[PDB]
Design goal:
Oligomer: monomer
Shape: globular
Order of helices and strands: HHEHEHEEEHEHEEHEHEHHHEEEHEEHH
GO molecular function, one term: aryl-acylamidase activity
Keywords: Hydrolase
CATH class: Alpha Beta
Helix content: 25-40%
EC number: 3.5.1.13
Distance between the termini: 15 Å
CATH topology: Amidase signature (AS) enzymes
Protein name: Aryl acylamidase
Pfam family, one: Amidase
Radius of gyration: 21 Å
Length: 490
């Protein structure tokens, strides 16, 4: 393949130097999708002709020496979860009743808008669970997205299709979204790098309600290298007055790649003091943390002092996500697509539980969840009063086997302790409460399957996260593990 396993940085250079045409990037990427995605089931919409049209125009500009963007020719796909791209479908993660929906003119979600703006070529959309409402990717319309490291296992979610394509070498970057961890969750299970930016760093368009009661929501890249994520972040970040958290600051994410972590004070937790975490994952993260001590950082265990139980926190997260989910369902019903009645079967029972639970949620309950969130935020802040970075395992458990009923979920217990199977083991959700930037870095394999370590920075310290990530990438590479998917039978 001229493009399998190439980085975005490599493709940009190949295209800019006229070694390969944008047309050939598109056809070769299509070949990889057609050849390799049947097992993975990561792609849910193919926009091949659009990509061909865009490639022809990009090729003409390159040949005539007209201006081209900073990701010119890099192939990518966006995520099918509140997707907005004019003329494209949006099924909210595999809701069959929405299969005929198409995006209205002039309405865009951030990843397709900004990536295409800098001449990345959008090839289609990737699979998500229904309404994003779990850390696995499966639904009853498209089915499960499978792990390139072992197709009997799930890629994770909700951005599972994004991570699976990147982990299988098919595109160098894919768009994820994250309300409880979903840029980072599937990255951790697929040996890819998932970057969740600070709140306000990348615009997020929530309409009709910009002041919704949910957790912080983010769009961001999943890549195989930290450099590619920095390149994507240079495109994705930036002021937009229509996002009421937007930061009016310009950064160069690539400037942090060579910075190192010498002298940094790093806090370490294996379970945030409140989650049950598989011992093998704890051990792997203890080892990974020591990579930083060899690079001149000082690492020590910290106690966040979170006074809520992990069930209390996951229940609050579910209610916070459920409120705008109910608003979506109510609006769709008004528009003639009724997911409460006629098309009830399209919603998982576990999700309908929360849908019903918040239908008449009291202001007292809303307030209690807000107090919980504040407490978690302040526990994070207590760490960053004294430390430059916090390390933790991204997730409390290893990948799960795919179900056969379209409802793959996580474990309901870890170490004998009950845990919410949709999101409870996704320890990432703490930064959707708190707003801190974080990235999942591949920490190694356990019994042949990937596990991630989360690097968290202080509020707005995205470049510190990039610097630590790149330092770890140099000292403890994970690229060799791609040999597993690279050699899998097709």
């Amino acid at each position: 393949s001229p493009v399998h396993w190439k980085s975005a940085a490599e493709i940009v250079e190949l295209v800019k130097s006229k070694q390969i045409s944008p047309r050939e990037v598109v056809e070769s990427t299509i070949d990889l999708i057609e050849q390799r995605d049947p097992g993975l089931n990561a792609v849910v919409y193919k926009a091949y002709d659009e990509a061909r049209e865009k490639a022809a125009a990009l090729e003409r500009r390159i040949m005539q020496g007209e201006p081209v963007g900073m990701l010119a020719g890099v192939p990518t796909l966006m995520k099918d979860l509140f997707a907005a791209k004019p003329g494209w479908p949006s099924t909210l993660g595999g809701i069959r009743a929405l299969k005929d929906a198409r995006g209205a003119a002039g309405v865009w979600s951030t990843y397709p808008l900004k990536m295409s703006g800098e001449d990345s070529l959008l090839l289609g959309q990737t699979n998500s669970p229904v309404y994003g409402f779990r850390g696995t990717t499966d639904n009853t319309f498209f089915g499960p997205t499978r792990n390139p490291f072992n197709l009997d296992f799930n890629a994770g979610g909700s951005s599972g299709g994004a991570a699976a394509l990147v982990a299988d070498g098919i595109v160098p970057v894919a768009g994820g979204t994250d309300g409880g961890g979903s840029i980072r969750i599937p990255a951790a299970w697929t040996n890819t790098y998932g970057f969740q930016p600070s709140i306000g760093r990348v615009p997020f368009k929530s309409r009709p309600n910009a002041f919704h009661p949910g957790p912080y929501l983010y769009e961001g890249p999943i890549t195989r290298t930290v450099r590619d994520a920095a390149l994507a972040m240079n495109v994705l970040h930036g002021f937009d007055r229509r996002d009421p958290a937007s930061l009016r600051v310009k950064l160069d994410f690539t400037s942090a790649l060579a910075q190192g972590v010498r002298g940094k004070k790093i806090g370490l937790t294996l379970n945030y003091g409140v989650f049950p975490v598989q011992q093998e994952i704890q051990d792997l993260i203890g080892k990974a943390a020591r990579v930083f001590t060899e690079l001149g950082a000082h690492v020590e265990f910290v106690d966040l002092g979170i006074p809520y139980s992990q069930k209390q926190m996951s229940d609050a997260w579910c209610r916070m996500i459920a409120i705008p989910t109910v608003a979506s369902m109510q609006a769709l019903r008004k528009e003639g697509i009724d997911l409460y009645g006629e098309h009830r079967a399209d919603i998982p029972d576990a999700l309908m539980k929360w849908i019903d639970a918040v239908a008449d949620i009291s202001v007292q309950q809303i307030s209690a969840d807000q107090l919980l969130r504040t407490t978690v935020f302040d526990c994070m802040n207590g760490v960053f009063d004294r430390f430059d970075l916090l390390l933790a395992p991204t997730l409390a458990c290893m990948p799960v086997r795919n179900a056969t009923d379209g409802c793959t979920e996580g474990p309901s217990q870890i170490n004998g302790e009950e845990i919410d199977p949709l999101i409870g083991w996704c320890m990432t959700y703490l930064t959707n409460f708190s707003g801190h930037p974080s990235a999942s870095v591949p920490a190694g394999l356990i019994d042949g399957l990937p596990a991630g370590m989360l690097i968290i920075g202080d509020r707005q310290a995205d470049l510190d996260v990039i610097a630590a990530s790149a330092a770890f990438e140099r000292a403890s590479p994970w690229s060799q593990y791609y040999d597993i998917p690279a050699g899998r039978p097709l």
